[PDB]
């Protein structure tokens, strides 16, 4: 776009919406985060 | 019960719609305009919908005429 | 130049009203008068009196809009000028 | 250690012809404009036309 | 301190844009080499200087039009060589890396083979990675060299007979039969998708700065 | 198709107009670059494409399908 | 016949197209070969050594 | 009576018939040259005709060089971009002449690349010593099959330069002459733009 | 099937030359130490899978962020 | 018909072999004769033209061009057909 | 009267950015700027 | 011109800018349907 300018000016910006939605009070928040153990897989007709 | 309509596409566009096609509209305004040139300037140089004392510049303005305005037809139908 | 050059950018964090009015009116005149005029006119066309009821219908509004359209569609100004103005860069390379 | 060169590596020296092997892909060499669909839904549709 | 410095080489950058905006007939090889190497020699640019006082530091972009101010190399000795790596050896100092463009239209400077190699030869000795660009543009520059061989050649025997023979013709349209990186397919000289002839031919000053000025302008619109 | 033949006949059987460079090249079908089972790869390199016997080299990050033989 | 001439149009591209496959190649090799004699010079001057 | 009447009146009528297609083997290639070799005779006032070269006796740049049959040289051997059909050099411009191939994926090379263009003009500098600051080099390829009117105006008209009186004097059947293209042939002109990423998957 | 060296069963969804899994010679499983993140050790890796899960996530597209510009200014990797 | 002795005609044996001056000639007179008399041809008028010894390629190439000048020529006889009409 | 501006993004958003795409137009030297320059002692060059 | 946009108010007529109005709605759906309402009307009357 050689000229259109004019409109660069009064132009917006898009949202931050990944970190906003991040960055909400969530209610599961921990002071110090542990990541969950391993949940048991099936291994099998004869194992279950 | 509900029927969504969008846009698909592939990282290509970030438009959802656009207009109608300037540049299909553009283009064939550009030839009807031509077309009601040449058929002005036969007109004029057998003065020095068009109807004639001259059979073949009749045939040949008329052609033209007609073609512009099924070129017009078009863009109207756009 | 006694010196080696740089190039700064300065972007302002801040429009005043002088600023950004003197943006605007540089674009109104960077658009085809007679479309500017055109336009106008359409607005206060489908506008009318401003009154609730006055406002045209969408039936009435895409037939006023028609109307304006078909009318300046035919000026060479539309279709042998205005029409290529938006072409990206790359394709004024290839036509020119 | 064996392999410690003072010529900087292939990245540097651009040997490689080609690319990626599609061309130009709107993720990984070109820029991506518009939305991402992470479910498949656009990706398997059927044309109406 | 080093003020003074960045000062003197005010003075030097002016009179090397004096010299090089002559870019005329009045200025020969032999002129030019030896006009060269008294500006070297007055600002003391040998790598033998200091970091500081270092002359080199603040030549904006002088430095690389200042560089291949020296390519062309008269015939008198083998001395001329040294002027190009004594300027090379400095950027080599001061961390300036030097640009494709720079090095393509050096090449583009060359008038015979030799002359090739010993610039490329000059920027081994001056420790220069090797990329494909520099590799490139040497090929360019021998089948240029080649190129304007042939056009010579041919220009010539048109000249003593006055219709072209059919030699010349073909010569014309497919250019050297069997080139390296040729025209026919434009495919291969390309290096990260770019095509990378300019050293393919000659270059006036007034190109180089057609460029640049194009820039500038480029700059104090959009 | 009958009935809308009829409906669109002129009297003079006219010449087809002049279009664009063209408009009717067929789509092609829109997928994601970035989450796929694979690239929607262009019609317009038809010239690249191999058979399902000997498959061009295409859709290198995605394991290749074997054919089964005896 | 109609078939015939636009299958022979797409045999005579395909061909075209793996001769010009076969140059990319060439020049791929020739590039890795530069590449190389980067490295190889750097060992053998240390092997002269 | 009418081919007696055909033959009086019409000397090239065989240059015609192959310009409207009706030589379905080898066609319409060879009677464009006898049509611009005649042409060329008529415009100048000496002309040598040496193998596939032909030149003035002027001292100023008249020539007409047949290169190679695009045709065959295309699909035969070396891939490549370029490949011409005619040159023809008037003085300070100089015109590639090519006849667009019958492959709708083969036209997308045929017409020469920027480089390709960039390199005849200063080979051309070089050899004819005409100056670099003015050359105007340039292509015009038509329909591969047969001629339309509006290739043979830009043929008349740009290539050879001929003012509206000297070309009805000189050919006088172009009047009649009314064919155009074909809806099937229009776009034989538009061509695929292809990105330089994208060059190992098509030509 | 009881026998061993048959045990791998019949997976159709495999890449491989044959959908019978233990006729395949190319690729020998182990059945003490594979596993863990598959679930069972005759299953294809996460890798090779041909065949997804609807909540599952499928395979991820190579590179080998500068081209996400346009889009949303956080929006990470 | 085609006969032994029958030969494919070049411009200039085209130009010798019929070679005759009148003056008065109505192009579109003439046209419409000649036209009209292949009009009146049925399709078995077309069988024996090809000349009788060739090469056989050849004879396909001027198999081809006589199959191509029989199309068109009844392609504009339904033409003038309908116009007449 | 004043008003926040949505400031038109950058191409590169950082001068780090900056350097390294800059840098691709150049040739890296072999030998980085403070070991070029030969030392005040001297080094007999042997073999690894 | 000032004389030019007040013309663009008039509406359309078919001798000036040779074009139907557009009314929507009835275009929408009987668009395709004229052909068969109009033979059902036993074709148009063309009088002078």
Known sequence: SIYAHALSQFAVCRQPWNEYIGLLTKQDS??????????????????? | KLSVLEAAQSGLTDYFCGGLNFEIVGFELHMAAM?????????????????????????????????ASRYEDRVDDA | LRYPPIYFIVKRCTLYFSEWAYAVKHQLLLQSPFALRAAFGLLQEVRGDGAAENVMPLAETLGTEFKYFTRLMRRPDFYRVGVHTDKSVEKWEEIK | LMAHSDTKGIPYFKVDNRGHSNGRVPGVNAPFFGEFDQKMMQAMSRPLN | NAYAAMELAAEARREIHELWLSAETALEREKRVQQVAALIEKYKLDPSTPREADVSRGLGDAFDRLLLLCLPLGKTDAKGTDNLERLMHLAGRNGRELSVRTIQHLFARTDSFAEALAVFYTMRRCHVAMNMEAYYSMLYSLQR???????????NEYEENGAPSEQAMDFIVKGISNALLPENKPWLGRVMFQDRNVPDRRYDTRD??????????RYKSG | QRNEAVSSHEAVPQTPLVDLPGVERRRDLPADPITRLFFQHKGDHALYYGTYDKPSVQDDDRVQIEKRVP | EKKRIEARQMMDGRQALKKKHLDLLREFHERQFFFWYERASERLQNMNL | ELVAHIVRNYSQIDIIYDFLGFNYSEGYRSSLRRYMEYLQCKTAENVRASGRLVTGDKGEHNILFD??????????????????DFLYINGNDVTLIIIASDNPWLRNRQLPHRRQMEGIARRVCFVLGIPPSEVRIRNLLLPPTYLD??????????????????????????????????????????????????????? | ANHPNRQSGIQFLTHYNTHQRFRVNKDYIDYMHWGKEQGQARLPHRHQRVAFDFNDQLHPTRIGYAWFASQDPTFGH | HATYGAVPLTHSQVTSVYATDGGKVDELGLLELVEERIFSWKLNKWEMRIPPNLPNDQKELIRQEQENLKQILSEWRKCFGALNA | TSDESHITPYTLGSVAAGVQRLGEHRLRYTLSPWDITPPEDSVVLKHT | ?????????????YDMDSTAALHVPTHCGKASRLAGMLQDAGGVQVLD
């Open chain 1, 30 to 48: 921990t002071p110090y985060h542990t990541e969950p153990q391993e949940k048991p897989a099936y291994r099998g007709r004869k194992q279950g």
């Open chain 2, 35 to 67: 077309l009601r040139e040449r058929a002005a300037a036969i007109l004029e140089r057998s003065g020095a919908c068009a109807m004639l004392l001259e059979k073949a510049d009749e045939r040949e303005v008329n052609k033209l005429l007609r073609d």
């Open chain 5, 145 to 155: 060299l080649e190129e304007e061989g042939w056009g010579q050649h041919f220009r």
């Open chain 5, 208 to 217: 180089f700065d057609e460029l640049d000025t194009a820039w500038t302008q």
């Open chain 8, 67 to 84: 290169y190679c049959v695009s045709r065959e040289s295309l699909v035969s051997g070396d891939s490549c971009q370029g490949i011409i």
């Open chain 8, 149 to 203: 009117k509006g290739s043979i105006v830009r043929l008349n008209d740009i290539v050879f330069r001929l003012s509206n009186e000297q070309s009805n004097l000189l050919i006088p059947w172009l009047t009649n002459y009314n064919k155009e293209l074909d809806p099937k042939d229009v776009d034989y002109t538009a061509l695929a733009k292809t990105t330089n990423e994208e060059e190992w998957l098509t030509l």
């Open chain 12, 1 to 13: 011109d000032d004389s030019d946009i007040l013309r663009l108010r008039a509406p359309l007529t």
